[PDB]
Ligand binder design. Structure first.
Ligand SMILES: Cc1cccc(C)c1OCC(=O)N[C@@H](Cc1ccccc1)[C@@H](O)C(=O)N1CSC(C)(C)[C@H]1C(=O)N[C@H]1c2ccccc2C[C@H]1O
Lengths: 99, 99
């Protein structure tokens, strides 16, 4: 698809068998999702945004679908304001910026 | 141009007669630049994301150049950790996400 930016680039994702809304976010290095249950062990990570820093849980090799495109990679879980698909998975689905 | 997402999509912008590096950020509704002078009236605004909110000055009808493309729009000025080109100006240069 080609997604214009007149509104927020919100898309449907599937993670843990559940449909959710997430923002395709080229300003995010990594993908961050609101509190939910994911399998496996997690590792600590601190991430910095416009308002400062938050602690998140880092899960690796997580299966996730983004607009029907299958990806498997790192998903951070924590108090993000909106679910964000960041560059780590945008690259997996072959997403680019174009003008 | 086509910009891949293996690294942060940073570009050079011209604003208020100054050159600055900024992040092409599809997660940002608006454009925010570190402290600098801009012409005209402004009003205060709070903007929020990861880590919470910061206070900025909102300047309207500001001309910026991004990769040879002139655009006009609202520019916020304040203590942002990274200079950010948001959707309000990305649309104007005809920037889209594609996969
Ligand atoms: C650096 C890093 C490492 C690992 C993992 C991650 C996720 C990561 O990125 C962190 C991050 O937050 N990145 C920022 C970009 C940024 C990087 C570094 C410092 C500050 C901002 C990006 O993802 C974003 O714009 N965001 C995210 S929350 C949001 C509401 C969707 C939106 C935002 O603030 N949006 C707000 C915004 C921003 C600028 C102007 C106006 C407005 C209004 C809101 O739309």
């Amino acid at each position: 698809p080609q997604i214009t930016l007149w509104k927020r680039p919100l898309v449907t994702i599937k993670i843990g068998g559940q449909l959710k809304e997430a923002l395709l976010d080229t300003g995010a290095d990594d993908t961050v999702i609101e509190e939910m249950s994911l399998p496996g062990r997690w590792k600590p990570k601190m991430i910095g945004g416009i308002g400062g820093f938050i602690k998140v849980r880092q899960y690796d090799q997580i299966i996730i679908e983004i607009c029907g495109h299958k990806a498997i990679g790192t998903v951070l879980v924590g108090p993000t304001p909106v679910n964000i698909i960041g560059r780590n998975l945008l690259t997996q689905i072959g997403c680019t910026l174009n003008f």
